[PDB]
Amino acid sequence: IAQARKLVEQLKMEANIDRIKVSKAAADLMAYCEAHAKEDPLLTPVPASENPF
Amino acid sequence: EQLKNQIRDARKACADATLSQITNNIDPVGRIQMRTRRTLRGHLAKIYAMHWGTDSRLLVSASQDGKLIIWDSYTTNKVHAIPLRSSWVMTCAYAPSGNYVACGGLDNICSIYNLKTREGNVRVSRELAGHTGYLSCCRFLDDNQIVTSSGDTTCALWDIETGQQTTTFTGHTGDVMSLSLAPDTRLFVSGACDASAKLWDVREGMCRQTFTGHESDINAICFFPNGNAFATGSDDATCRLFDLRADQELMTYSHDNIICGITSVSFSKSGRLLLAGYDDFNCNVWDALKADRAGVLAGHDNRVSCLGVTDDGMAVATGSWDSFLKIWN
Amino acid sequence: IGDIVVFGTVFLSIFYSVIFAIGLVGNLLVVFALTNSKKPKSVTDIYLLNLALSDLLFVATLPFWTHYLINEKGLHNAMCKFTTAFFFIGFFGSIFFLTVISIDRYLAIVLAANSMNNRTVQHGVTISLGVWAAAILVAAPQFMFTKQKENECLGDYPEVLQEIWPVLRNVETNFLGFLLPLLIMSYCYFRIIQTLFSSKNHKKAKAIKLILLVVIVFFLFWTPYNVVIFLETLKLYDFFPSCDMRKDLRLALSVTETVAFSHCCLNPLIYAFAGEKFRRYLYHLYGK
Amino acid sequence: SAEDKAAVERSKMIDRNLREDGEKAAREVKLLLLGAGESGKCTIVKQMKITGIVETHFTFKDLHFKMFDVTAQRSERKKWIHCFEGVTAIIFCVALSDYDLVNRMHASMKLFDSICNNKWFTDTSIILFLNKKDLFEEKIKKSPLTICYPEYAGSNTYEEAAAYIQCQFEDLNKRKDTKEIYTHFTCSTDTKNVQFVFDAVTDVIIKNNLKDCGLF
Numbered sequence A: 001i002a003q004a005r006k007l008v009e010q011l012k013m014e015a016n017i018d019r020i021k022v023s024k025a026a027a028d029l030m031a032y033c034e035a036h037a038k039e040d041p042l043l044t045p046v047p048a049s050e051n052p053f
Numbered sequence B: 001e002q003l004k005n006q007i008r009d010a011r012k013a014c015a016d017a018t019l020s021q022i023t024n025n026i027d028p029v030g031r032i033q034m035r036t037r038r039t040l041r042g043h044l045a046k047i048y049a050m051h052w053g054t055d056s057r058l059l060v061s062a063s064q065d066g067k068l069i070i071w072d073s074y075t076t077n078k079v080h081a082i083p084l085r086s087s088w089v090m091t092c093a094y095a096p097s098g099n100y101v102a103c104g105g106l107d108n109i110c111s112i113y114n115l116k117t118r119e120g121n122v123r124v125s126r127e128l129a130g131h132t133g134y135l136s137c138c139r140f141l142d143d144n145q146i147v148t149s150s151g152d153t154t155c156a157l158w159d160i161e162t163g164q165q166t167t168t169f170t171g172h173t174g175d176v177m178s179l180s181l182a183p184d185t186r187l188f189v190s191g192a193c194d195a196s197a198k199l200w201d202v203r204e205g206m207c208r209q210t211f212t213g214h215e216s217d218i219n220a221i222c223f224f225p226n227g228n229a230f231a232t233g234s235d236d237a238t239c240r241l242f243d244l245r246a247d248q249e250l251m252t253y254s255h256d257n258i259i260c261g262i263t264s265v266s267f268s269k270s271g272r273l274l275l276a277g278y279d280d281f282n283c284n285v286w287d288a289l290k291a292d293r294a295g296v297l298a299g300h301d302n303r304v305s306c307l308g309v310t311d312d313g314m315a316v317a318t319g320s321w322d323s324f325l326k327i328w329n
Numbered sequence C: 001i002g003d004i005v006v007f008g009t010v011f012l013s014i015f016y017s018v019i020f021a022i023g024l025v026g027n028l029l030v031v032f033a034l035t036n037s038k039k040p041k042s043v044t045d046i047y048l049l050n051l052a053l054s055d056l057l058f059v060a061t062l063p064f065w066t067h068y069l070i071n072e073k074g075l076h077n078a079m080c081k082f083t084t085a086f087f088f089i090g091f092f093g094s095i096f097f098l099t100v101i102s103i104d105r106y107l108a109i110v111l112a113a114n115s116m117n118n119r120t121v122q123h124g125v126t127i128s129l130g131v132w133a134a135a136i137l138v139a140a141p142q143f144m145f146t147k148q149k150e151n152e153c154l155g156d157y158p159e160v161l162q163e164i165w166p167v168l169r170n171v172e173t174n175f176l177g178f179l180l181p182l183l184i185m186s187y188c189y190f191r192i193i194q195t196l197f198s199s200k201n202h203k204k205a206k207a208i209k210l211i212l213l214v215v216i217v218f219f220l221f222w223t224p225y226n227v228v229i230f231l232e233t234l235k236l237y238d239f240f241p242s243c244d245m246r247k248d249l250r251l252a253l254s255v256t257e258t259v260a261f262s263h264c265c266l267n268p269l270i271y272a273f274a275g276e277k278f279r280r281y282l283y284h285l286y287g288k
Numbered sequence D: 001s002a003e004d005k006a007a008v009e010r011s012k013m014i015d016r017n018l019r020e021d022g023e024k025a026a027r028e029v030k031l032l033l034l035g036a037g038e039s040g041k042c043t044i045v046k047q048m049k050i051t052g053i054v055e056t057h058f059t060f061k062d063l064h065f066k067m068f069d070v071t072a073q074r075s076e077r078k079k080w081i082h083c084f085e086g087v088t089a090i091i092f093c094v095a096l097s098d099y100d101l102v103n104r105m106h107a108s109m110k111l112f113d114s115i116c117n118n119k120w121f122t123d124t125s126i127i128l129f130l131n132k133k134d135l136f137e138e139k140i141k142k143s144p145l146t147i148c149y150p151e152y153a154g155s156n157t158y159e160e161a162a163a164y165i166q167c168q169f170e171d172l173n174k175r176k177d178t179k180e181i182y183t184h185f186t187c188s189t190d191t192k193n194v195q196f197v198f199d200a201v202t203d204v205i206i207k208n209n210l211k212d213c214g215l216f
């Protein structure tokens, strides 16, 4: 099958990409969240003086 | 299935610690209050999509009445009224420069309109034709390049000047429902009606990675503010967060009480707070890290179809089928 | 023929008080039900809201009658003009809006394609303003020549007008009550019934039956007032041979007012047992 | 505050334009076209006056109708059929001579069952059209129809076969109080078909007007 042969090459690219530990990715995500936590009006409520809504 | 086991083994090998265990040290956000600061009124049909503006004041919404109007969120009034040739619109996009607006739908063509660039009037700029399926989603890559997803399992990138497809992504299996743009404006991820959501490369035009785990069709998807992760909203009452590096669902957001599917998924400015627009007439607010409910948004009468978060996080706009748009915070 | 007033003033005042309470509660519930959700309201919904507003006008003008009955203080000519104006504009608005509901149902059922094609059908707000303006204009002559004489405010017409003004007013109000609206409603509902039976929608036409029942209740409870108005018109036209009518007319007017206020209070009670969604809304409201 | 006043008045004028446009759209009649492999029976009329969705406009008895064919939409039906909620009626086309062809009748009945029992079109009625009647006249003679239905137990004539097909299609409703299915047989002339469409639309409008009140 032409489609089956083409799909074989597609899976090779996905399998050959570099993959890191899930713990490191989660730690990076948490670090980014804490980095911008003070700049999030949803997470940190903003006074109505600076709130334009 | 030799390749199927290789990717599965790599995910298992890279699996070291779940996000829930790591988030034990951090303090839960807890319950927070959602209040409608203002309500946008004037639509007479179900609202299916909306997009926030880069100016954080102007937003555009799409409704089944054939009108694609732009709302001024600061002063609570409409600034433009764009009639649509086809009343069946299911997606809309707002250009980052603010001079362009897009809308798709069941007409299989993506229309581009000039947002009062000259002469103080709105007119059709380009009609992107070449899709054999309904435009499920569309997003402006640049002021001249736009990437859209259609109902024919294929995603295409369009150029306004040429009017043709610069590249086409046909690696999907199920019907694509939505796509999101990474902040770096170099990658985009799209979810399909199958169980696999796969990342795409703008320059390469090939499927770099594929993510699985959902038990039903994926309806919404949105990149995380960092740009190395994204969340998927499916009909299996489960929101799964996927990391572009871990290549696995490091965090799942499924609650027994809410068994309904997810229609819209959006992230806050920091990404700690994740908002998902469910179709149980509400829009549950989750926490990306703690993977638990952080707020309740029950200000809509009909099912929530679209949900948008402002770029600076100033306010959150939620749309639903009741032809009403409400701005939160 | 002979009639004697045997109605206790304290019992009648208590009756008006309980009528006020029931009517206020019913009108508030109806208005809340018709403005409960953010979804667009149908034209019939705004017509029912206008009818509830007319009933609210009735329950707001009856306190003046109670003040005459028991308080007997502050009974000025201006206040009599105020209360008579409210009562008559409420009655005229009620009858006119019921006629408009009948016409709207006739268009929606019989000339459904024509009604949908017409754009003025959906524009119910301008129709409501026009109906209110017409009711105010037609009730304007009903109270603009009244004053108080001997603890009973009536008459006080100019000598030139008094020859024909009272009889003309009575015949005009009797006509605009039960001559044109009666025939119009009868024809409209007859056509609606014919269409429903021909198209076999009678098993699901609960709203039409409810509106017809409300119209019938209104007509039966307002019939004595128009009958005594016609008797007064005949008496002024010396066509009535009996002499005891000149004595029993006051009691007839009093009892017609009482039955009219009873109709006003029980008007939105019909929507409770007969209206499935209204009853469902009451359960939701009682939960809060 | 001149700029604010100008913005406010522009917003009010475009809001009133949107309101009048929505009222005009509501004055129109929206119809949805469906079918497993049969289409064009209603679009071939001469009354029509005006890509995945094709919009056809035709005026009959001073009433404007809008048809939306979905044949070009080959994607998943459930992902976009919700956009058609609120249509006055749905036109479903079935070929009477599809029983022998391949299973086609079974597929059409399955599609009809899926559309009717989709918990999104419960209030809206369905107009059923049975086309290819002229060819079915000889098809029922040539094909005994017993192979299609093992438990048919009926006469091998056109009338009995058509009645059985109509009954089988009606049995897939399971919601008779909420919606009513109108069944018609396609004729040589389009006048009968357009008259049936107008009658069904008028009946649907009457039914909606019966429940328009939000207080009864």
Ligand SMILES: CC(C)CCC[C@@H](C)[C@H]1CC[C@H]2[C@@H]3CC=C4C[C@@H](O)CC[C@]4(C)[C@H]3CC[C@]12C
Residues within 6 Å of the ligand: C046, C049, C050, C053, C057, C085, C089, C125, C128, C129, C132, C133, C136
């Ligand atoms: C003696 C008279 C002139 C004074 C009192 C008149 C009052 C009772 C009448 C006159 C006109 C009426 C209004 C006319 C039309 C509308 C629009 C409708 O959608 C809701 C009710 C509303 C808002 C009516 C409410 C009551 C109203 C204000």
Ligand SMILES: CC(C)CCC[C@@H](C)[C@H]1CC[C@H]2[C@@H]3CC=C4C[C@@H](O)CC[C@]4(C)[C@H]3CC[C@]12C
Residues within 6 Å of the ligand: C095, C096, C099, C100, C120, C126, C127, C129, C130, C131, C134, C135, C176, C180, C181, C184
């Ligand atoms: C003589 C008795 C029976 C009349 C009772 C019904 C009257 C009050 C109703 C019936 C239909 C109504 C009209 C219907 C249409 C409109 C058009 C609108 O833009 C302004 C008001 C206007 C002109 C309405 C005014 C009042 C009206 C004439």
Ligand SMILES: CC(C)CCC[C@@H](C)[C@H]1CC[C@H]2[C@@H]3CC=C4C[C@@H](O)CC[C@]4(C)[C@H]3CC[C@]12C
Residues within 6 Å of the ligand: C183, C184, C185, C186, C187, C189, C190, C193
């Ligand atoms: C202007 C003149 C000609 C109007 C005449 C009014 C007559 C014809 C109409 C007005 C109301 C109508 C009735 C309303 C209610 C029903 C109940 C239904 O189950 C049988 C018919 C019946 C009993 C109708 C028969 C005819 C009817 C009495």
